Design a protein around this ligand. Structure first.
Ligand SMILES: O=C(N[C@H]1CCc2cc(F)cc(F)c2NC1=O)c1nc(Cc2ccccc2)n[nH]1
Length: 266
């Protein structure tokens, strides 16, 4: 189960903090100011069910700081920051670690979809890396932490990439996300891994970009200088198909990618 951690346990709003017994952790204190004990029953329940998600490639919610007008979400430390951070970094990450990161993302996403979780906001900012270069899927924006997310955005507190978003979600906020909404996102994460930068230059995410994407525009494959195996380009094109029922399922992706990684990349 989850821990109902006290502020005291941590020796001297996102910040780093040392647990007396457990060790190193990251924390985002979402709430401050007045007390709102009316949501305090739910916030704990959302947290203990998010904690039910236990996979090697899925971030573990270690505990919650639930106190008088101060609410925090604590998780394990991922030393190497996020995926984009690792790719833009000075030391060039090799084709053998890239393909493994790709297998691990497939492993993590398939698990979530297994457990009925739809990420909704998959992107490199939500793919975290440990020292050994292993990844974990995170929900830093609380897109899946429904209660905690609005608590974070409320007026009683004192404190957005469209690039990875499926065309059916652009200009249509009332469309219910599917398992394929995560699959489009993945295909653009595939491109990002091989091009070592953000797609569609760096700007703007205005009505021009959005309309070009909904019509059929996808990231520039020819902007990948580095060697990219034929098979993984077929995959990104397959996954970012305009029609969601054209896009594969993650267990389907896994079935074809695992043998490929083994022979060609590992
Ligand atoms: O990301 C996660 N939890 C953060 C949220 C807020 C935050 C933002 C920060 F910038 C720094 C942080 F330390 C915190 N703390 C947390 O506990 C988290 N994902 C998962 C697994 C899962 C679930 C569904 C979809 C995908 C992934 N479990 N916890």
């Amino acid at each position: 189960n989850v821990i109902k951690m006290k502020s005291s346990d941590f020796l001297e709003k996102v910040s780093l903090a040392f647990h007396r017994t457990q060790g190193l952790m990251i924390m985002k204190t979402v709430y401050k100011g007045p007390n709102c004990i009316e949501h305090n029953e739910a916030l704990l329940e959302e947290a203990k069910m998010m904690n039910r998600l236990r996979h090697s490639r899925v971030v573990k919610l270690l505990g919650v700081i639930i106190e008088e007008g101060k609410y925090s979400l604590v998780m394990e430390y991922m030393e190497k920051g996020n995926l984009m951070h690792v790719l833009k970094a000075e030391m060039s990450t090799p084709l053998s670690v890239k393909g493994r990161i790709i297998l691990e993302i497939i492993e993590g996403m398939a698990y979530l979809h297994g457990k009925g979780v739809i990420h909704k906001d998959l992107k490199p900012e939500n793919i975290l890396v440990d020292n050994d270069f292993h990844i974990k899927i995170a929900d830093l924006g609380l897109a899946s932490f429904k209660m905690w997310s609005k608590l974070n955005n409320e007026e009683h507190n004192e404190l957005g990439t469209l690039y990875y978003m499926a065309p059916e979600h652009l200009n249509d906020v009332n469309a219910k996300p599917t398992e394929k909404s995560d699959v489009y996102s993945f295909a653009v994460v595939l491109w990002a891994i091989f091009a070592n930068k953000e797609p569609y230059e760096n700007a703007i995410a205005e009505q021009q970009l959005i309309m070009a994407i909904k019509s059929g525009n996808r990231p520039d494959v020819d902007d990948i200088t580095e060697y990219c195996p034929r098979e993984i380009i077929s995959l990104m094109k397959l996954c970012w198909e305009a029609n969601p029922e054209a896009r594969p399922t993650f267990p389907g992706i896994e079935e074809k990618f695992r043998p490929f990684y083994l022979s060609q990349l590992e």
